[PDB]
Amino acid sequence: GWINEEKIQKKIDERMGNTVLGGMAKAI
């Protein structure tokens, strides 16, 4: 489905999805 599968991944995108932007997309 989609209901948790959107919620769960948006949370993974904080815990590690910040450091990868602090690596490739912005890298400050």
| Residue keyed to tokens 């999805």 | 17
For 27: left if phi > 0, alpha if psi spans -120 to 50, otherwise beta; the answer is left
Distance CA 3, CA 7 (A): 7
Cα separation, 28 vs 11, whole angstroms: 22
User: Which experimental method was this entry solved with?
Assistant: NMR
The whole-angstrom separation of Cα 3 and Cα 16 is: 21
- Residues sharing a CB contact under 8 Å with residue 28, sequence separation 6 or more, in sequence order: 22
- Asked if 22 contacts 28 with a C-beta cutoff of 8 angstroms, the reply is yes
Tokens 């995108």, residue located: 13
